RNA sequence: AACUGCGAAUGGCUCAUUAAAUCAGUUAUGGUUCCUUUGGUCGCUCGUACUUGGAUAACUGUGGUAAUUCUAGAGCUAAUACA
RNA sequence: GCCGGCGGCGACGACCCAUUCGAACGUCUGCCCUAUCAACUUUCGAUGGUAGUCGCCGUGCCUACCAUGGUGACCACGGGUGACGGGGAAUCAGGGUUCGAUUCCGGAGAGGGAGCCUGAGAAACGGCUACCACAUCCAAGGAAGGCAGCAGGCGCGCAAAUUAC
């Protein structure tokens, strides 16, 4: 069609939001921002559907327009603003801080953090370039362009940024025997340790990840995010420890709890 | 003979609300009107029945139970601000103007055909 | 576009041969024994059983 | 044929009904914005030279300045052209426009008095005119009153006296836009402040990276000794 | 009320066209544009400023045509419009 | 507010780089019937080469000068389609056959063609300009058109709802 699309049909929305069929015809339609439309989360969904604070669409803008909600220590009134992976949502009214981490089954989970941990965030560097009198530059997965990076930071490494400033505190290299998390494909939300990468020139690089419970799986390089140094994570994990336990013991656990 | 229970509560500081799921047990009589639910809930939470708002009561098949949504505001000012107009109009705190969509959209399309201050004159 | 589902399913299968003694008897015995309204209610239970049996057969 | 005569000096205008060929033969075969000596009109017009500014033909179509014809013509009119105002942005319409050359076949002719004559024609020159509003821009007020930079403008701003039945009189003045106020100076020093912040930011970042890179290339060189 | 900014290229409808075309799965832009959002950049240039200029709407007043969301002439006045 | 200057919190802007939403050109593999369609394309670009032009860019996209190529019984080219293409639907042992205008995705067009203004984005039709076909008002001078948006009406036919809030 002519020009860009403005709407989004409800059934055409990405599955990990878990919008039901009958509520309406349209969906939230995440607006342009740091994270991709397919792999983000509108605040209207997070507030209304996940935290169960707002009932209707009006209550969400009535919350947001009173400027009670910050994303990465910055006030956002846009109810369809895309907050994606590693983004820290802060409610300073009720003093509640959330980090958006994918759960085992492959969706953003309502994972609370201490206010002391809502100071920094981890970020995967997309590229590294230099320009105009050679001040080198870095670009990350949440589109934060940072000047004068540490020259030890190469492409596909992770960096820890203080949210109040815009400067790198510490960084993790992408090497063998490092804790990573999958952010795309069948294995989305699984945490594990790198074993090796198999470089395919002129094509996608494939990496092999071993889980804590002896489960080994492969994934594309683009869908990898280093979260810890060695085996120890630099952030809190969700309810489960990123362990994909199968339907058999899912049933056994559920029936055991009953 | 009516018993009021509350199911999922929440202290919504973000909208200055206490929001909850109302369970009404009325075995013999008909579906209890909203005003009696309001005052009995207001008595239960030790507040004015003016600052209480209840809706969406679906009486179960057989007629032993009725489930609905309730919310109590911290003060009537926050209630006046945050609550939608349709739920004020039932309490009688808001008045709607007696004009149809046909009438206002008609007058709009007539008002298009004149330029200047005469737009207000066409009525 | 409308916010409605069109997920509707038939719950009974009619017999292949419409008039067949031995069958009609067997259905009328079932009605007579369990006071069912019409032969739709017998076909309903046959259809549900058949689907359970087909699920068991394709699992084996 | 009628004459829509206006006097800009007094700001008065009258519609005259002239139905005598002799009085209009002076005006015929003349273009727009042409100075014509209005004598044949009547006695009162002794020393009046008048300009032809517009008018409408018997169908009511107006005439443009630049159309060097007699009858009407179809012109694709865009933004800027007279006898047209667009409804949408960059939206053009083909419309019937009368030729700039005047003839006998005109419903009205629009006349503007450029100069006087001996005595005032009743309708126009007798009655006073008041151009009601004045000077909103500070420099316009200064240019009007010839005030030097030391002199204030709010003191010599225009005051509009306004009175209506069943209410005491009011004197209203306009919000003088483009006037230097402490607020504007504060915005200007607020603008110049950030420039100092950005330069010290660049210098401190560069200095920090220089100290970082120094040890980085020192340790990078150290391992090259092997 | 009007000038200015933005939107009106989405949505909705229908299936005439269309046979390696449309379209589907897979890859490429190292061969290109991109409103908007989100980051970066914005005294890095060595040469009246304590704020410069002109107009036009709106409004008032005189009009034309049988006729339309038609518009000409006259008198003022704004800018994040135009310079 | 601090000792006549120096300032905090925003909002509009902004050359350019990154990003998001895209869009546009491509790569490989895949489509119904027809030989009573067997050779087709290249005068007026067909296939390729060099140089430009034009375009947001790659390119016969276009111009100039050269080469004589490119596709085809593994079905080209031509004709037909009561042909928009998929995700799907009905039926059903296994294999299959038939349907898919129709709510999600992509394409197309606003009676038929053609040309363009504005804009980041349109060859836009609830934007304009012309012609072709229909047709409204009229003082006969001129003026104004676009339901395959929602209702509703006429026609067409075996075949399809309320000028509602």
From Swiss-Prot, chain A:
GO terms for molecular function: RNA binding; rRNA binding; structural constituent of ribosome. One of its GO terms (biological process) is translation. The modification N6-acetyllysine is found at residue 232. Residues 41-103 form the S4 RNA-binding domain. There is a cross-link at residue 229 (Glycyl lysine isopeptide (Lys-Gly) (interchain with G-Cter in SUMO2)). It is found in: Cytoplasm; Nucleus, Nucleolus. Pfam families: 40S_S4_C, KOW, Ribosomal_S4e, RS4NT. It comes from the Eukaryota. Its main location: cytoplasm. GO terms for cellular component: cytoplasmic ribonucleoprotein granule; cytosol; cytosolic ribosome; cytosolic small ribosomal subunit; extracellular exosome; focal adhesion; membrane; nucleolus. Keywords: Acetylation, Cytoplasm, Isopeptide bond, Nucleus, Ribonucleoprotein, Ribosomal protein, RNA-binding, rRNA-binding, Ubl conjugation. Component of the small ribosomal subunit. The ribosome is a large ribonucleoprotein complex responsible for the synthesis of proteins in the cell. Part of the small subunit (SSU) processome, first precursor of the small eukaryotic ribosomal subunit. During the assembly of the SSU processome in the nucleolus, many ribosome biogenesis factors, an RNA chaperone and ribosomal proteins associate with the nascent pre-rRNA and work in concert to generate RNA folding, modifications, rearrangements and cleavage as well as targeted degradation of pre-ribosomal RNA by the RNA exosome. Belongs to the eukaryotic ribosomal protein eS4 family. PANTHER family: 30S/40S RIBOSOMAL PROTEIN S4 (PTHR11581), SMALL RIBOSOMAL SUBUNIT PROTEIN ES4 (PTHR11581:SF0). This is Small ribosomal subunit protein eS4, X isoform.
Curated annotation (Swiss-Prot), chain B:
This is Small ribosomal subunit protein eS24. It is linked to Diamond-Blackfan anemia 3: A form of Diamond-Blackfan anemia, a congenital non-regenerative hypoplastic anemia that usually presents early in infancy. Diamond-Blackfan anemia is characterized by a moderate to severe macrocytic anemia, erythroblastopenia, and an increased risk of developing leukemia. 30 to 40% of Diamond-Blackfan anemia patients present with short stature and congenital anomalies, the most frequent being craniofacial (Pierre-Robin syndrome and cleft palate), thumb and urogenital anomalies. The gene is RPS24. Its main location: cytoplasm. It comes from the Eukaryota. PROSITE patterns: RIBOSOMAL_S24E (PS00529). InterPro entries: eRP_eS24_sf, Ribosomal_eS24, Ribosomal_eS24_CS, Ribosomal_uL23/eL15/eS24_sf. GO terms for molecular function: RNA binding; structural constituent of ribosome; translation initiation factor binding.
From Swiss-Prot, chain C:
Signal peptide: none annotated. Coiled coil: none annotated. It is found in: Cytoplasm; Nucleus, Nucleolus. It comes from the Eukaryota. Belongs to the universal ribosomal protein uS4 family. Component of the small ribosomal subunit. The ribosome is a large ribonucleoprotein complex responsible for the synthesis of proteins in the cell. Part of the small subunit (SSU) processome, first precursor of the small eukaryotic ribosomal subunit. During the assembly of the SSU processome in the nucleolus, many ribosome biogenesis factors, an RNA chaperone and ribosomal proteins associate with the nascent pre-rRNA and work in concert to generate RNA folding, modifications, rearrangements and cleavage as well as targeted degradation of pre-ribosomal RNA by the RNA exosome. Component of the small ribosomal subunit. Identified in a IGF2BP1-dependent mRNP granule complex containing untranslated mRNAs. Part of the small subunit (SSU) processome, composed of more than 70 proteins and the RNA chaperone small nucleolar RNA (snoRNA) U3. This is Small ribosomal subunit protein uS4.
Curated annotation (Swiss-Prot), chain D:
Keywords: Acetylation, ADP-ribosylation, Cytoplasm, Hydroxylation, Isopeptide bond, Nucleus, Phosphoprotein, Ribonucleoprotein, Ribosomal protein, Ubl conjugation. This is Small ribosomal subunit protein eS6. The keyword Ribonucleoprotein applies. The keyword Ubl conjugation applies. GO terms for cellular component: cell body; cytoplasm; cytoplasmic ribonucleoprotein granule; cytosol; cytosolic ribosome; cytosolic small ribosomal subunit; dendrite; endoplasmic reticulum. InterPro entries: Ribosomal_eS6 (IPR001377), Ribosomal_eS6-like (IPR014401), Ribosomal_eS6_CS (IPR018282). It is found in: Cytoplasm; Nucleus, Nucleolus. One of its GO terms (molecular function) is mRNA binding. It comes from Homo sapiens (Human). There is a cross-link at residue 14 (Glycyl lysine isopeptide (Lys-Gly) (interchain with G-Cter in SUMO2)). The lineage of its organism: Eukaryota, Metazoa, Chordata, Craniata, Vertebrata.
């Amino acid at each position: 069609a002519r020009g860009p699309k403005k709407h989004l049909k409800r059934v055409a929305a990405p599955k990990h939001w878990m919008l039901d069929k009958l509520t309406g015809v349209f969906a939230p339609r995440p607006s342009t921002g740091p994270h991709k439309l397919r792999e983000c989360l509108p605040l209207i969904i997070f507030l209304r559907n996940r935290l169960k604070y707002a009932l209707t669409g009006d209550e969400v803008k009535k919350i947001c327009m009173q400027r009670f909600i910050k994303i990465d220590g910055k006030v956002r009134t846009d109810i369809t603003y895309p907050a994606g992976f590693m983004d820290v949502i802060s409610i300073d009214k009720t003093g509640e801080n959330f980090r958006l981490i994918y759960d085992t089954k492959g969706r953003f989970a309502v994972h609370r953090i201490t206010p002391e941990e809502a100071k920094y965030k981890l970020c995967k560097v997309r590229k590294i370039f230099v320009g105009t009198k050679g001040i080198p530059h870095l670009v990350t997965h949440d589109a934060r362009t940072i000047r004068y990076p540490d020259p030890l930071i190469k492409v596909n490494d992770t960096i820890q940024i203080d949210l109040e400033t815009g400067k790198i505190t510490d960084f993790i290299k992408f090497d063998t025997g490092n804790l990573c998390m999958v952010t795309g494909g069948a294995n989305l939300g699984r945490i594990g340790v790198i074993t090796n990468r198999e470089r395919h020139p002129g094509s996608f690089d494939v990496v092999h990840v071993k889980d804590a419970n002896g489960n080994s799986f492969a994934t594309r390089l683009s869908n990898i995010f280093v979260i810890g140094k060695g085996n120890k994570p630099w952030i809190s994990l969700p309810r489960g420890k990123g362990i994909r336990l199968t339907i058999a013991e899912e049933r056994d656990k559920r029936l055991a709890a009953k | 003979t009516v018993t009021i229970r509350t199911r999922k509560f929440m202290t919504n500081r973000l909208l200055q609300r206490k929001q909850m799921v109302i369970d009404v047990l009325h075995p013999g009589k008909a579906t209890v009107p909203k005003t009696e639910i309001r005052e009995k809930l207001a008595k239960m939470y030790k507040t004015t029945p003016d600052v209480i708002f209840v809706f969406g009561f679906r009486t179960h098949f057989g007629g032993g139970k009725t489930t609905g949504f309730g919310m109590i505001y911290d003060s009537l000012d926050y209630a006046k601000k945050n609550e939608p107009k349709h739920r004020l109009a039932r309490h009688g705190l808001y008045e709607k103007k007696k004009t149809s969509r046909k009438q206002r959209k008609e007058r709009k399309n007539r008002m298009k055909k004149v330029r200047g201050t005469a737009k207000a004159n066409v009525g | 576009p409308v916010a409605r589902s069109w997920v509707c399913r038939k719950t009974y299968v009619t017999p292949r041969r419409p008039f067949e003694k031995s069958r009609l008897d067997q259905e009328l015995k079932l009605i007579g024994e369990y006071g069912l309204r019409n032969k739709r209610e017998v076909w309903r239970v046959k259809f549900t059983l058949a689907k359970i049996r087909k699920a068991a057969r394709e699992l084996l | 044929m009628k004459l829509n005569i206006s006097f800009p000096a007094t700001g008065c205008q009258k519609l005259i009904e002239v139905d005598d060929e002799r009085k209009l033969r002076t005006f015929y075969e003349k273009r727009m914005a042409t100075e014509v000596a209005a004598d044949a009109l009547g006695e009162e017009w002794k020393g009046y030279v008048v300009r032809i500014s517009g008018g409408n033909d018997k169908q009511g179509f107006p005439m443009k300045q630049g159309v060097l014809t007699h009858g009407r013509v179809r012109l694709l009119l865009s933004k800027g052209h007279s006898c047209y105002r667009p409804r949408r942005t960059g939206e053009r319409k083909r419309k019937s426009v009368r030729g700039c050359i005047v003839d006998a076949n005109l419903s009205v002719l629009n006349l503007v008095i450029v100069k006087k004559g001996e005595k005032d024609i009743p309708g126009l020159t007798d009655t006073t005119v008041p151009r009601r509003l004045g000077p909103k821009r500070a420099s316009r007020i200064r240019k009007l009153f010839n005030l030097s930079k030391e002199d204030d403008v709010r003191q010599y701003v225009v005051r509009k006296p306004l009175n209506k039945e069943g209410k005491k009189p009011r004197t209203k003045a306009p919000k003088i836009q483009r006037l230097v106020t402490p607020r504007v100076l504060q915005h200007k020093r607020r603008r110049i402040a950030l420039k100092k912040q950005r330069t010290k930011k660049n210098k401190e970042e560069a200095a920090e990276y220089a100290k970082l890179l120094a040890k980085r290339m020192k340790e990078a060189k150290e391992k090259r000794q092997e």
